[PDB]
Amino acid sequence: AKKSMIAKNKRPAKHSTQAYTRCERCGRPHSVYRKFHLCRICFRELAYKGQIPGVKKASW
Amino acid sequence: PRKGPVAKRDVLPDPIYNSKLVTRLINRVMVDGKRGIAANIIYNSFDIIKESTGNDPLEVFEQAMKNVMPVLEVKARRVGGSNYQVPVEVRPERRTTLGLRWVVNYARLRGEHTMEERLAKEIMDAANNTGASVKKREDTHKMADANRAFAHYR
Amino acid sequence: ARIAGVDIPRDKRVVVSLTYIYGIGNTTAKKVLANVGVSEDVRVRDLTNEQTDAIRAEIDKLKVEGDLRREVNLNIKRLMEIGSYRGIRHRRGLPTRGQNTKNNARTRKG
Amino acid sequence: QKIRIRLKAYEHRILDQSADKIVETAKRTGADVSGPIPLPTERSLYTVIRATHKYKDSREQFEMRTHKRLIDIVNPTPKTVDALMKLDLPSGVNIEIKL
Amino acid sequence: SLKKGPFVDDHLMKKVEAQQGAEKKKVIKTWSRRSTIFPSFVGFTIAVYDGRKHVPVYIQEDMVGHKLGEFAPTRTYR
Amino acid sequence: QVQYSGTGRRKNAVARVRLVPGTGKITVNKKDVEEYIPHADLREVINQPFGVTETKGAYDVIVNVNGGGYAGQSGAIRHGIARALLQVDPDFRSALKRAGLLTRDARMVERKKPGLKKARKASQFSKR
Amino acid sequence: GQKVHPIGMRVGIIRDWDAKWYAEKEYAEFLHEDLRIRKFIATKLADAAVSTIEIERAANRVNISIHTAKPGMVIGKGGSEVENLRKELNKLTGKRVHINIVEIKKPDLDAKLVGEGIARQLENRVAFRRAQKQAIQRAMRAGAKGIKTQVSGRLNGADIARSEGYSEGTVPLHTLRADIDYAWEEADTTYGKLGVKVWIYRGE
RNA sequence: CACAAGCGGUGGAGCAUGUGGUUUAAUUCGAAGCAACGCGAAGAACCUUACCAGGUCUUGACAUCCUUUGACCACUCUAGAGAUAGAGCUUUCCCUUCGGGGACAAAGUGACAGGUGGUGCAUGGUUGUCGCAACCCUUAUUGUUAGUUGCCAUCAUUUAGUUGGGCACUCUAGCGAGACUGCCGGUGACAAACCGGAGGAAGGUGGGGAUGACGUCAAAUCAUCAUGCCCCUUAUGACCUGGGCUACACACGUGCUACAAUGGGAAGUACAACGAGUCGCUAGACCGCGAGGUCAUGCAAAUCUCUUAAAGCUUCUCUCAGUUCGGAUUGCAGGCUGCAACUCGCCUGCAUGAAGCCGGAAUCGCUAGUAAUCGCGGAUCAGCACGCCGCGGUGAAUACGU
Ligand SMILES: [Zn+2]
């Protein structure tokens, strides 16, 4: 079930400590960055294609 | 390694006595990279040596080193499924390596209330042909010059 | 005999020998010895019979005796005889605080 | 001194280009513009697992640098205000003029 | 540690206030295992849902600071 | 006055040293070098350039140091003192050059790699 | 999985970001607005063969530019289609938008165009061996240092999957100053999905 | 670093955590020699949540169409564990040529929706494992351009780099230089290459990163996402409260703390770097033994704060003991976040004071600022780290040989 849960995520929560983040492309609930609102492996996918401005591969 | 022999790891002679041997002795006492503690220990031990029935810490230390270092070590080897042991000579750096190693190891196991009361006492006992370090040397010389039997044509 | 309950050891300072009575830890010994004015001086108990009675009369104001073991015992006793989830565990030799029993009972169950 | 700029960007090429634009069009009509002083270039770091299901022990790391540049203007004139608040190029560079 | 007043639920406290008059009934059936045992719960018989059933628990006096969940376990070992 | 200035770097620490004729002494950050680096004997590492060249006095040394640890910012002080001595007379660039005392030590802290416990220490393994 | 994305290895070295704006404290909203935009305008792209799209933005206006190979069939008769693009994009972004349409030259030398075209033959029951061959033939005639193609999946609409491609000229991948291009598309004939990849080397 | 030479471990003890096994109403699903087992999970009290027990709905929690049409609400009060139902002010034309279109509740109305259900042996995509060099990044030296919020050498001044002054020095960051067997000696087929020297901050791919060919294991993943075929459809779909995911006769892996004097305790004195901050980081003053609390202050940041680092050094103790070592377990009293800490959080104080005196067979990591040891920051996040990613401080032993 992953189409009712995205709907249930966007309605206002029943208590303060009941809201939680999800990805915005997919609905992945684990390991989302809250500066981009993207999950672990949409970040690595849109960093290539140079769409996220800023981000690039790091080496030092 | 496999390619061939390697360098020798130059050391920096300590400034107090200007003697690279005291540097290696400081490096062997030190544990966990706490070097100032090792330095304090060696200097207190030498103060204890000179103050009590001493002449100079370098002299008695060199003599103790001379009395402990080995001159005939054996190597246990494998041939084709049966293993033995054979004596061989001993190159110089290995000699001082072994000497320092034994002295520190057997001072660490003394049983007094300070590493200095152990180190000074042990290298004094060593500069007078006594102490488990000298007995370790003689165990080595006795293992050699006996196990030359199955070493005579190795 | 010695100064409280039984047998405060010899040869040690008072701030440490006073630990040996059930109910006196380390800061409690400090506070007791400070409400009177007794120091250690130096690594021995060479007190006076005024110092012993001094440090004896003040311990009476605490629960340092087999009057404390009674309290602890009857506490666990009240626990195990109502419901009780904590007492149920007290009766099995199992951790009574929530401890994910995979190894954490070798202390609690040997 | 009662007028000063701040410019942030992700590319020092565009950054220096626009800084020279403003400095040139400022000293053309006035004088005494303090140089484009460089600031210490913040950096961030993002580590991510590069596989969808397993294998934690192989990762890929990203970053995002943010270059900074400072310009202070000394003794403006009723023409510098005009000739400054009008030039606007380019797109992805932050400009923030505080008195 | 709710030193800003202990915690009951309104439904539970409503029911107990309503029966506070006369001799009491065993039908106080609430889920509510987070509530503490106020000193007025004595003598009643609360039914505490343990995830599967409604266990009854008789409130003596020694149980007066604990919670209602401490008297209805959930695991079923041996 | 006349003075001589040099800059010394070692392992995240940078020092700014000043040579000034005097009677032989060194103060760092408005304190005495006996108290600032009172460890045991690092001072006998600091006074080495005077020991090898321009033997051996007399200059008061004033330094400004910041960064690193107590053992890094003494090798840095030594570096700086040597450079300043070089500045006094260029004829010293041989005796100093023979005994090190003129080069920067480029031994920095190696960076940590992912999947490893440290820069090079790996996790514990089990063939089965 | 043992190759890096060739236009993510090179971003920030010799090529630029396809999204050039700087914002802080309004960054998530902007990124998802760009995603929405770009995921919408794949409507006309279904026929008009667009390749890239560059989003810039100002105080409250959003400057857009799209690279296509069909200028008239994307703007209208006298300008009756860009009108609709703007009046539709305003309904999403709630801002002012200004499309500045570019036109692409030499369209056979573009990774997305080539691969998307030679992934439309596979749907019309065409054999793959000559689709890729004619693709690299009409990519070399435009003048290119090298090209490489690859199709994957259930080939011929058959059983267990395999893969095969063809190469022409050199395509150096490890050279950072190389200016290579890349794209990955999909299609079906009747069975599952297929993956078509294409690399073109165009000097540096 | 495959053995050999070494240094420190694991296996013994307590605790944290993952897995098997058993148990259960459920202990959700995936990973299985190297290449599964602090792995997906970079955050299980409710949520997350797929699992279980009770209470509920059926064109539907979510999308399009067509018609009546059209502006939908939110707020208050009783019943209820809530889901929901019953009553109260009312969802009320924003285009008008008098003739239409956007948002939307209900209904009808069925096309239809919905599935973390199966098949990684039907697939795309994304990884693991065996495992050219240069162009790019960072670190080691310096010229020049620019001196604020950085810096203070030549001057007065105060609590002080603070305020007048200055951009010398350090620093920050744009653009350039510099390392090429490039010179000098020997070996060697005079060749490639190797050994030694000069000069220089650096010498022989200076140190480290990114970069992973053709292929191998029908290796991993329908549970990130897509998707061919099969299956469910008043239920395998959907809403709510409470419970597992944390159960414990045991077995295996990865870690943390110790078994003390190179130590434990009390007082004083020092020295970093990477990063984070607006309803966030908290200066300062006071109250509390403490964790903390109150009034208040600067800062959207080289300006203020998190942030006086810990090992270190100097004094005074303690004396080889299951102990002034060790800190498991239990009793009582508090604090903080949160609607709420029983199952099942972190922290504080007083009391208690377990095993453990260096660990067999066997087995692991590492070639230099490395091993060993010591702290600091942040992603995720109300709260919650012995795990993960980075940063710097002190700083070794050895490599005869295949
Ligand atoms: Zn995602």
Numbering used by the authors:
A (entry chain n): 2 to 61
B (entry chain g): 2 to 155
C (entry chain m): 2 to 111
D (entry chain j): 4 to 102
E (entry chain s): 4 to 81
F (entry chain i): 3 to 130
G (entry chain c): 2 to 205
From the study:
Ribosomes are the ribonucleoprotein machines responsible for protein synthesis. Here, our goal was to investigate the structural conservation of the Enterococcus faecalis ribosome compared to Escherichia coli, a model organism for structure-based development of ribosome-targeting compounds. In the analysis of the E. faecalis 70S ribosome structure determined by cryo-electron microscopy (cryo-EM) to a global resolution of 2.8 Å, we find that structural differences are located predominantly in peripheral regions, while the organization of the functional centres and antibiotic binding sites remains conserved. The cryo-EM structure of E. faecalis 70S ribosome presented here revealed that the architecture of functional centres and subunit interfaces remain conserved when compared with E. coli and S. aureus.
Structure determination by cryo-EM using multi-body refinement produced molecular maps that reached 2.8 Å for the 50S subunit, 3.0 Å for the 30S body domain, and 3.2 Å for the 30S head domain by gold-standard Fourier shell correlation. These maps were used to generate models for the 30S head and body domain and the 50S subunit. In the 16S rRNA, larger structural variations are located in solvent-exposed and peripheral sections of the beak (rRNA helix h33a), the spur (h6) and the body (h7, h10 and h44). Motions described by eigenvector 2 include a stationary 30S body and 23-degree rotation of the 30S head with respect to the 30S body.
